[PDB]
Amino acid sequence: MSSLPVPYKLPVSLSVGSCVIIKGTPIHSFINDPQLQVDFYTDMDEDSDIAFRFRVHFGNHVVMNRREFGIWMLEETTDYVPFEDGKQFELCIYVHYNEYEIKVNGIRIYGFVHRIPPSFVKMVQVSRDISLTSVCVSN
Template identity: 65%
Template structure:
């Protein structure tokens, strides 16, 4: 039995994944003194992993990690070692509103789109055919996942 949030993939040529944010985060200011913070919350609020094996210790061909209000981070993990992070600063998310996240697997890259807008192209670090498992984690409600050829 697979842990919750994990699906095995037969193969991955041109998948589209769609996600909806679970709940909005309170954007109202506290009446107390406003403090400036530049650190991320401990855990991301959205994480998508494309694994090359069928367990969480496998290499990760592509990871999309998001702390709302901060840049998205994309990376891969090889033999347990994270490679160079790539950051995307343009994120058309609106606090508390549903969104559509699409990750297309193209010939040379993953094309990441939010609400129909391209936000980033992440060059393949593993052959796309090596992906065997998709994992979606954190503070979201998943309404649909599409994997198509």
């Protein structure tokens, strides 16, 4: 009604210089392990490979990884998660030549190096404990 379906699937084409911009609000923040997940898939089904998963445990940490043929690779984390319960955030994922750069409300929190070319990404999926207002791919 007032927000997009979650989980949400958007077909995309990414190039160097692209930015995936997600606007939403953390909800259910009183539960034990509230989360946000963003997956960059290489095809339209959820069994396809994942170039980049960004999984936030709100108030705790972010875990990032890549899946090929069902197998997860080298996991990366940071405890820098500057979201606010019940307040809208702007999550920007910039596609650079060498990495995805993740900014939360304008502040870089991480850079995840490409394991496969970002041009291989065909779909972005947003899931878990958010209300989702908008998603798009800019430039």
